[PDB]
Amino acid sequence: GITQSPKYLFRKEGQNVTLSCEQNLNHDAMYWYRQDPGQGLRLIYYSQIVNDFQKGDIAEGYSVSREKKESFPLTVTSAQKNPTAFYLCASTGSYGYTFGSGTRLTVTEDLKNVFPPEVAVFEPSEAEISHTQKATLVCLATGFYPDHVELSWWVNGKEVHSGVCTDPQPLKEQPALNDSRYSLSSRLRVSATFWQNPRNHFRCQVQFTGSRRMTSGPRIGPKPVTQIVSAEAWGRAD
Amino acid sequence: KAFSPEVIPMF
Amino acid sequence: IQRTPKIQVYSRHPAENGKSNFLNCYVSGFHPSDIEVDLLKNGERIEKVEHSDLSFSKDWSFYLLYYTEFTPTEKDEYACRVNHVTLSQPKIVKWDRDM
Amino acid sequence: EDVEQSLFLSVREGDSSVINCTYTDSSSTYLYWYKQEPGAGLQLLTYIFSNMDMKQDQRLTVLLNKKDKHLSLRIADTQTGDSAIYFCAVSGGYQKVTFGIGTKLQVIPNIQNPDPAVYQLRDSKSSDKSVCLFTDFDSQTNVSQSKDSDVYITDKCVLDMRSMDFKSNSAVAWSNKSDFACANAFNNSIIPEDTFFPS
Amino acid sequence: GSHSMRYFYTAMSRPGRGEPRFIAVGYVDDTQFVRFDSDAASPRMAPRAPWIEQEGPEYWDGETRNMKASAQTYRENLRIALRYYNQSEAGSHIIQVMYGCDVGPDGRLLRGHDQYAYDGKDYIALNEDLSSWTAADTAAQIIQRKWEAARVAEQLRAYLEGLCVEWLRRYLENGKETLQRADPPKTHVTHHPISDHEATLRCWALGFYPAEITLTWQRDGEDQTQDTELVETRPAGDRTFQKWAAVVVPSGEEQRYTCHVQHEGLPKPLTLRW
């Protein structure tokens, strides 16, 4: 019913950003919340009807509009010294709320720290195969910042969901640092015989959401832009 | 005391 | 759609000349709610005049009680003057201490 | 308004979980449960009016003690997909809701025949600096953070081979050190028997 | 079927003048206990009966926030009605709302109520089953479908079966001295000569509570309905009520006429002569 795009957003300190929220549910009322660790859901702004907006509990530095139904775009200014949050758009028609899938905003001091992931696949060990008749592949996405990745596994050109486990949480390369780069691992486990079939193709794919066109980059390294990084393997017959 | 609707009785 | 006000003018207690009482004008059965009610003493409009809170009967028509504190005598005469969209001109209903 | 719920909560798969909530205001006549997968939105599960003692929907049962201002959610025969954050919420009307902080519910799968082992995987591409995999351990096993700073070890996570109807735990370790060998890459922690295999 | 609680809302659009006026009033039986007017300096739910004053500040705050919010609801409902009926935005219109519960002597629900009107005519009404709606017209029919889909009945049924019943029981206990002690009428008969042959006998009932009363005239113990002038029951102003009944009677023949008074506050039905 409600769609929020994009799923991740990245902005330099002191720069306006408008988050998108669209609905096909025909509800009158829509709402904007934020969610932070060690805190639940704090209201920001709400709109019971088109052309009307009311401040929530924490509006300091936010602005919204409602000109049509269907849509309720939030804008984050140089609000607090903490605009980094998970933002959830919501609507009501009958008891309770319908929620969008949320947008993550990360606001940084400076872009010097943004990096795309490096992606590598690691092939199953011969021993696991002999001991269990199962084969576990492993994918590592390393050195990325911010933590805005979507990792997926693709078997013979189509995304798989069965047999896959991806870390719920990234590892910080250096856990003390605020702006540490990140690592994430995933596993795909298949039958021994499936991995042993050399016509089976295995691709680990990492969508990274980084910089856009109109973000300035002076570093001599390539600009860490929104991109897909992949690594692959074919099956090994014995 | 008065009725306090969760869901507006909107026409 | 449109209903014309019913009117009763009366006192809170049986009228005794020289004693303190209240003078009521109960205006009921009307629609819409906009109404002008004035109490009169010898043709003159009384100033300290209050009313109850707008309410309505099962048939959606409105009622109101207008009242003022007063001392009846035998020489003074009282009335209620009502105006409303359903009316040609203001209807004046005289106070009758026996009704 | 002030709603309190346990951060709490880990149950075995097949057992029954109960999540608790209390609220302070008598005007809270609309009471709710939502669940959230981390990274996604809240999904409405139940609502109840303060009028009612209990309400049931499939595997979910909500009881309310209006006197004790106490709301509970019972999940019958918990499954792996029940693992999530659970939020009670209360409103006095106009959807002016107060959400609790949320209760993270962890559903532990029963590993049928555990075969805890560490394996070494080779890079499909370049040479060395590769990964070790600790898998098939039961769900009591901890798996601890890395002693060394240049060694990365992940949390355990549960993988469901649905076609085979087979669940299993695993944790992944790697390092750029050459004196790093899989033999004792996981040895830095508590529980199971011992370690290595690879041929 | 001893008791009832009732709330009435009046929402009056007045294009040209300010925003639409919103007035709410609450009753237990025939006693007004509460009042809200969106026109006041600072709009607040305010007491109108001694026994409600004992509710604390958070009762008053909660009721106030509800009324301010209910104002907004009906302010918008006026605009929707304006569209459904294709009316000029220059015209003044009125939405009215009624709801409440009836309880028996036991304190148990007999039935609930929730009806809405537009410009003095029925619009939509909750059925007695508190689960379904009856629309008065094709415009209200759209509302019914909206309210059906949004399941608006569920919350109303919960209010009426629960909070409505429980607060009414509370109020009847707190105000028992006044709400549960019926004040019998004070009755007298007056004589008004209209000529030589005829005089009016007027039978008075004064200072009674509740409003429900029966006054009848008999001649030689037989009824006189066609010949009885009845006025509508009217408020005294002090929370009590008045009524009178009159019959035109021949002179000398006054002793054959009897006035009969029934009211819950009298131990027995009265019989009065001049």
First-residue to last-residue Cα separation of chain A: 49 Å
Total count of domains of chain E: 2
- The CATH architecture name of the largest domain in chain E reads 2-Layer Sandwich
- The CATH class assignment of the largest domain in chain E is Alpha Beta
Radius of gyration of chain A: 21 Å
Q: Structural class given helices, strands, pairing of chain E?
A: alpha+beta
CATH superfamily of the largest domain in chain E: MHC class I-like antigen recognition-like
Large-scale geometry of chain E: globular
CATH homologous superfamily designation of the largest domain in chain A? Immunoglobulins
Greatest chain-chain contact = A-D, 53 and 53 residues
Describe what you observe in this structure.
The complex is a heteropentamer of chains A (238), B (11), C (99), D (199) and E (274). Chain A has 2 helices and 21 strands. By secondary structure, chain A is mainly beta. Chain A has 2 domains: 1-109, Immunoglobulins (Immunoglobulin-like, Sandwich); 110-238, Immunoglobulin-like, CATH 2.60.40.10. In chain A, the strands form 5 sheets. In chain A, strands 2, 5, 6, 7, 10, 11 and 12 form a 7-stranded mixed beta sheet that branches. In chain A, strands 13, 14, 17, 18 and 19 form a 5-stranded antiparallel beta sheet that branches. A 4-stranded antiparallel beta sheet of chain A has the order 16-15-20-21, with no helix packed on it. In chain A, a hairpin with a 5-residue loop joins strand 5 and strand 6 (41-49). With 11 residues, chain B is largely without helices or strands. With 199 residues, chain D is mainly β. In chain D, 0% of the residues lie in helices and 45% in strands. Chain D has strands spanning 3-4, 10-12, 17-23, 30-36, 42-49, 54-57, 60-65, 70-75, 84-91, 97-99, 103-108, 117-123, 131-135, 151-153, 157-161, 166-175. In chain E, the strands form 3 sheets. An 8-stranded antiparallel beta sheet of chain E has the order 4-3-2-1-5-6-7-8, with helices on one face. In chain E, strands 9, 10, 13, 14 and 15 form a 5-stranded antiparallel beta sheet that branches. Chains in contact: A-B, A-D, A-E, B-D, B-E, C-E, D-E. At the A-D interface, strand 10, strand 11, strand 13, helix 1 and strand 14 of A face strand 4, strand 5, strand 12, strand 13 and strand 15 of D. Strand 13 (118-123) of chain A pairs antiparallel with strand 12 (117-123) of chain D.
